[model samples]
Target: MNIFEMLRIDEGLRLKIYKDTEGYYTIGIGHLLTKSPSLNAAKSELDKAIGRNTNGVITKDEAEKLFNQDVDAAVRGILRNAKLKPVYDSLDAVRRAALINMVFQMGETGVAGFTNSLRMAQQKRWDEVAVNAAKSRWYNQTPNRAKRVITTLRTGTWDAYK
Candidate 1:
């Protein structure tokens, strides 16, 4: 699957404001609006992006725009990391999405913590990478998502997350 499909499935896309399970106001693809610098700042950002000050529901096009921006930033951050860049370049398209998804879930610095795993990945040792990846604290924190991407990395499958 492509980045948008993967993220939208995991993030549970919604075009309208809904209180999340934790009761935080959210809209679009996992865009949390419960807090920012302040709720006002969050609302102002929303208004600026969607061209409205008080609309509760976001247009589908606006949501797509925001998703594209978010995914682009995530991909850029992955490639920008000095250590991760070569590792990312060594990957096939499907395996590359694994890294992008990891960076999407965490920031660049966060995934850069997988020193040995990334090292193995660079050498195309996907099995070892998956094993080492499972030992991460991030794996423990987000097991389902982590496992899904690890499967993609290990098997070089495009639709593992699906």
Candidate 2:
């Protein structure tokens, strides 16, 4: 599935907007913070930014402005990167969403710095991916959050918070 489809905002978190000389529109998790220029703007500016700056190449300050610090923006940024992106891309929507959530909290650099775990994933050693993903500085920095990502990577499902 496409990234936008995976991140499709549900009803509860949607925001209403009315642009002058434009019209009304519904803003969801990504757009509301990432690139909602106006109710009328057609293009997703945040997507443009990511397209311009690949693999966590952009600065946090730039990302914050583009995404308006929306939680999903950080998550999307992680997904945009090659390392974490593939893992999330290989999963179902829910699993991908959960991965994004964890990445958002961890930050792309923190996630990319996971050398051992990512190497495992690169080698198709999923078990190692689980172990390595769980053993990084990012994981150490946030135990509960790290557990959550590792659980998803391990089991492909996370009903409990972990």
Best by TM-score: 1
lDDT of 2 by residue, 1-162 (tens): 332333332112322232211222323333332234552242243335446523223444453344444555666686678887776556666556655655544457766777676666545576777876765666666576466557655665544342
Q: Which residue runs of candidate 2 sit more than 4 Å off their true CA positions?
A: 1-69, 122-124
Relative to the true structure, candidate 1 reaches a TM of 0.82
Please give, for residues 32-86, the per-residue lDDT of candidate 1 as tens digits.
Answer: 6654435565576677767776566787877887778878988888778899899
Model 1 Cα displacement at 107 (Å)? 1.2
Residue 128 of model 1, lDDT score: 96
Model 2 compared with the native: what TM-score?
A: 0.47
Model 1 misplaced regions, further than 4 Å: 17-26, 32-38
